[PDB]
Design a protein around this ligand. Structure first.
Ligand SMILES: [Mn+2]
Length: 266
């Protein structure tokens, strides 16, 4: 019966994970479209005040929320951000990718459970039960990263993006991004020469990207940088396959650790 509306995927799962069958949860941003820039339509705005609660990640993430809450009211859906209580981090422009930390993730699950139990105090034990059980999985997940990081002597991983800033900090890891580096078009002669030398003094083995690397790129990097390319994705979205496959936060996050391994445990 409880109706909750969420922004992008990770917010959706956390919520549903604690609510399960006791509530109808949906996601405004379909898992296959950039959430960062996504902008709501009048229809979406309606469904928000239409629901019992609206869950979002951070005002620095879904930058359209603050405007939405104002142009709506309180009698309608009760807004609730999961990043509430998280000291954020060095992004003015803050870094909203906190859910990419199994620890901060737990926090969000707590922050959401709160508003959930409040809104529907009857099913209190239920929501509470599920919540604890997910925080467990999340903690079981945290052990892995915390174990692999200890057994790792690399402590640093090169990337093309930088959404993994909170995952690094949580495990004394260093996320070193590169200049003009895209998974689509290969780097410029000037950039490549810059990255190339950086790999000579860091014995760089793998380079991660937001999505799969194209032929050109994946190839050039091999010969030129003499390195490979791995994914390491932000649970910002899910491929149609993963959806039908069920692969979620814990699943896709485990994938992310694997890739890391092929660099940390060298
Ligand atoms: Mn992002």
């Amino acid at each position: 019966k409880l109706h909750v509306v969420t922004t992008f995927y990770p917010m959706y799962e956390f919520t549903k994970q604690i609510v399960k069958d006791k509530g109808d949860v949906d996601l405004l941003i379909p898992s296959s479209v950039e959430p960062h820039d996504w902008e709501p339509t009048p229809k979406d705005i309606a469904n928000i005040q239409d629901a019992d609660l609206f869950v979002y990640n951070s005002e620095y993430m879904e930058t359209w929320v603050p405007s939405a809450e104002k142009s709506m009211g309180q009698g309608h859906a009760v807004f609730v951000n999961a990043s509430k209580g998280i000291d954020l981090m060095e992004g003015h422009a803050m870094d909203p990718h906190v859910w990419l930390s199994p620890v901060l993730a737990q926090k969000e699950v707590k922050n959401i459970t709160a508003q959930i139990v409040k809104q529907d105090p009857d099913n209190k034990e239920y929501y509470e039960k599920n919540s604890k059980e997910y925080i467990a999985k999340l903690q079981d997940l945290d052990k892995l990263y915390r174990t692999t990081a200890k057994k790792a002597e690399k402590k640093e991983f090169i990337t093309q993006h930088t959404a993994f800033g909170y995952l690094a900090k949580e495990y004394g890891l260093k996320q070193v991004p590169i200049a003009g580096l895209s998974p689509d078009q290969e780097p410029s002669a000037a950039s490549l020469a810059k990255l190339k030398t950086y790999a000579k003094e860091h014995n760089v083995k793998v380079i991660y990207f937001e999505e799969i690397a194209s032929s050109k790129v994946a190839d050039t990097l091999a010969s030129e940088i003499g390195a490979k390319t791995e994914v390491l994705n932000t649970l910002e979205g899910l491929s149609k396959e993963e959806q039908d496959k069920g692969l979620g936060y814990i699943d896709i996050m485990k994938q992310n650790l694997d890739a890391l391994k092929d660099s940390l445990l060298v």
